[PDB]
Symmetry: C3
Subunit: 174 residues, 3 copies
């Protein structure tokens, strides 16, 4: 059985991210350029802070006909005491993509499948949908609420942004 | 149930690849050196362009007794609209190796197993055989034509090098 | 069926490791800093040299209230002629963590699950317990001797440090 899990990734500009390591000779992004990053992670219903994203984007090429970039990404999604999911695959600044779920830990031990990446604001807001197989149990209800409709206007609940107990999961990752 | 999938990876020198980020003190390759890369990918029977490889080789050490290098590699194999496969493991410039299949997306959702890497011409021609488990369906026939036996003299079909419709899969990755 | 596999990772200061690639505008580790590394790997009972670790630590943040750093790690564990295990997930210099097992090769083909990381001496001694699922066979006896309980004072057997045949596995990775 497949369990669907959606989350919002938001860059609130307070984690030094992204860091651009410019090694390609061009003013535009190119092969050689490396981009370590870490953003905040919220539930799909935007009610609770769950953790962070964390990893590395490797520039593969500039795509002038689409006015954007192709990256190859290696990173994880942290859900506090619930554990984490790890992924590998493409991030295209100009269109949606699917990444491979490489594994997980905690409640995500044994995870496999794929995840859809949808960019809403380049690069500060993204919406993910994980198609999770291999989990030992049903996902906890506080992670499976109906998602807010994805758009460039989405915002976390005020309590979540402010890190009030009602707006965070237990030991949310920071 | 294992499904064998073979592909040829070819560096045609038109993707700015490899990019060498030389940070080690050694005059030879050494720990600290990083090599982002992206090559072209063709079917095992060399009749069609399918996509690209994309990722990062991390130098681990120079191996002077073998006149070559050990890399630790993290990268993906793209097959146009069919999806992609992701891998992790050793790339040794001086001998064949096996890498882990970390997962996949599209028709490769659920992929697991190992892949054999055989270098045919250093650094421009490599042959892979994926021993794929976990897939939902039989691989499409377009991808499973009988492979050309590997040797240093192999070449992709002229029509595939020229990107003619009969020499590419639909929406091949580039 | 879970098979537990424990190993010790030791930096004996003879592999040029770790290599720090400094890009954060900070005296402390920060986002932008990259750390390619490779350490020696010994069996859990400390009787035998098996191989090496090899990969990349990506700094995510300095955590001053915990007097340590958060890294995102992508790397492999090499076991000589037996094959390798690959992983993805968090390395926290200040506490234990669990990483995803992303896959394997050789006798580790098909591996999945999670692995516990325990730091013993920062940064030179670590202990791991892999909770391995998906393997084709029982692990070989020379890898599954009763582990030495982790403590800061552990040392590999003298025969293993001296690379005598009784203290190594066949074709131990180096
Ligand atoms: C793979 C998922 C990535 C999620 C977004 C995360 O931010 C990374 C994306 C990597 C590179 C995007 C590049 C955009 C450049 C603008 C940033 C401004 C700056 O701080 O210099
Ligand atoms: C993910 C497992 C880590 C294994 C330990 C291996 O050594 C790498 C860990 C990466 C970074 C540790 C930081 C070392 C700082 C040492 C300071 C001294 C120096 O500048 O050489």
């Amino acid at each position: 059985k497949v369990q669907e899990l959606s989350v919002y990734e938001i860059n609130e500009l307070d984690r030094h991210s992204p860091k651009i390591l410019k090694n390609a000779f061009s003013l535009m992004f190119g092969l050689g350029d490396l981009v370590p990053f870490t953003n905040k992670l919220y539930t799909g219903d935007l009610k609770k802070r769950v953790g962070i994203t964390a990893g590395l984007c490797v520039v593969i090429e500039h795509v002038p006909e689409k006015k954007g970039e192709r990256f190859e990404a290696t990173y994880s999604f942290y859900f506090g005491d619930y554990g984490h999911l790890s992924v590998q695959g493409p991030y295209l600044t100009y269109e949606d993509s699917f990444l491979a779920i490489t594994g997980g830990a905690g409640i995500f031990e044994g995870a496999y499948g794929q995840v859809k990446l949808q960019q809403l604001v380049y690069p500060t807001k993204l919406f993910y949908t994980f198609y999770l197989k291999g989990l030992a149990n049903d996902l906890p209800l506080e992670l499976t609420g109906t998602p807010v409709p994805p758009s460039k206007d989405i915002e976390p609940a005020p309590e979540a942004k402010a890190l009030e107990p009602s707006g965070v999961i237990s030991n949310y990752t920071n």
